[PDB]
Symmetry: none
Subunit: 252 residues, 3 copies
């Protein structure tokens, strides 16, 4: 069904959800640093990577399918689009999420009134370009996520390699992904999450504008990566892991 | 177990200030009015020092944990000398609490090690024994050691001495433990992977923390050397000390 | 492809040449170059015969080091993995003014036993077996360089990925490299006027624990990783970058 790979054997399970257009291979470089401290669940989201053969679906539905293969309890970490999925799971079944971690994610990707974000028509235009130029629209959207850093070239290639080492996902899965980002808004639903909530950001993130407002989710904690863009775990793997190890400990 | 903690100022951003070994939060008396309009200022007496009486010797880890417990959710943390190791330890342990790390006249590894400049262990050991057998003479030796070499040296040591004479000194055990922290702690590798901004202020003439280019090659941190300051550049050169703090607030937004 | 492929990454103004091992290419450094590009100008090399430098054949260890030198910077730290640790070492014998420091990782001066090590006739086996079953001989030799760790099957498929995404090295060059391992002893020519850092995996099958005799090289330093086998920068990235960053502090 859903490509799912389990690695390591700590008593704390960690579910890692990638972002739009990509797959679990994005975690290749931090899985070695984590697998001795967690049982790690590498997931290709439904419609993505080796989980082809799903079309579009609602965020809720994406979260129900990943939930249906998850361990009983686990820390849930979502990167970007994956951050919304991991968020939806915490909303739907809080007893399953010992703690929620989002990486370079926004509860509401599209700019709303007095809420920073992407212009709803920038993203709408990205769905049109996908019709006209499929292959190069995915590559251009991923090129956006490593821009701005003193590492952009090797980081853009890490992402680009990870989409090109597998057959492209369906164009309907991806367009649906873009729609989720365009229309989803979880700011309120997370106001009262009952479990530990850790939000990680990159300062130079061109998609998720740098946090102070979500800080004012008073129970959640946030870390801003000062020299990272939209993929802090690629450009800053060692700073990325350490708050996760600290988080396993705090749970205890 | 509660720590002396005074919040002053009416400023946008939070700034925790941590004094060095043997002193107390009064060392900041004469820069707080220039910072008061830009930061909410958190003036702390480290566990076992000054007004947070009744603590003995502890590890840097326990020390940083006790301070962090009365800390605001998110602040900029500025450490002077040993306070710099405390603030650094906080950065490492609890990055979500630390908007930015600043150290003044402070070293990640105070004692000289191989290929690493610092206080020679035997010189530190001599200071300890001197402190044990000849307390008040060694306090004066210490106060001179922080101000020596600058245009302003006597006036500055007098200012530091005022902060010493007017509060309870730390217990014999707290004193010895803190020297043992400086003797043993090495945070060099630990601070490579810090996620937040890291600003390091130094005095060119500082005789306790030698003149910086090894640490710059922490490539994501920044460093500033005041040509004319020694170990207390916020005493000797208040105006230049605050400027990079305003620049930091600009960077954080 | 009669050119040595050579890529430069970073702005750390200390230079660091990275030399891969038998069969592999610079892609094996994919997960550590982020950790190190902030601290070094990195030169990723594909040894001649391998990776993107495929249009070469068999050649002596000194021919290899000479070809690799021609495109190397004026001065640099030279770090070699496995077979690459013999190219590095050779370079710090032919032209030591070019080499600010020599680092070897899970490598030995004389790979074949005499002196603990690998039996010579079982490196004859791989050479012969390489003609009777090309693919599985390569796979089985590569498998030796990761097995022995808790992460053996992740680390193994990291190496296979790096091999499969580029042209398979020539049987000639692959045979040539096995020849270097089998024949060469550099134990005597390394008794050497630069700092000499030596990195080992306790669980390394191909490289035993000849460390304690090579500690006697009285001015060579050695570090053993207690849970690494032949590929410790893959199995343990963090513990691998730390000694490199402290070596850079010990210069300058």
């Amino acid at each position: 069904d859903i490509w799912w790979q389990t690695i390591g054997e700590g008593d704390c399970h960690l579910v890692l959800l990638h972002g739009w257009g990509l797959n679990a291979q994005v975690w290749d470089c931090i899985t070695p640093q984590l697998a001795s401290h967690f049982t790690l669940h590498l997931v290709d989201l439904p419609g993505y990577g080796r989980s082809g053969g799903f079309g579009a679906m609602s965020l809720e539905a994406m979260a129900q399918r990943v939930l249906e293969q998850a361990p009983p309890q686990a820390v849930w970490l979502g990167w970007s689009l994956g951050g919304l999925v991991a968020s939806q799971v915490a909303i739907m079944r809080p007893e399953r999420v010992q703690a929620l971690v989002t990486v370079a994610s926004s509860p509401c990707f599209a700019a709303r009134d007095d809420w920073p974000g992407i212009k709803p028509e920038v993203l709408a235009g990205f769905q049109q370009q996908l019709s006209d130029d499929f292959q190069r629209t995915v590559e251009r959207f991923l090129a956006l996520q490593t821009m701005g850093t003193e590492s952009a070239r090797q980081d853009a290639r890490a992402l680009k390699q990870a989409v090109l080492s597998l057959p492209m996902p369906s164009a309907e899965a991806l367009n649906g992904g873009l729609e989720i980002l365009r229309t989803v808004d979880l700011r309120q639903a997370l106001v009262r999450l009952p479990m530990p909530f850790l939000r990680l950001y990159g300062r130079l993130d061109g998609l998720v504008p740098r946090i102070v407002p979500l800080l004012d989710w008073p129970e959640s904690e946030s870390i801003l990566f000062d020299k990272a863009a939209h993929a802090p775990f690629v450009s800053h793997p060692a700073a990325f892991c350490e708050p996760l190890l600290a988080l396993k400990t705090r749970l205890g």
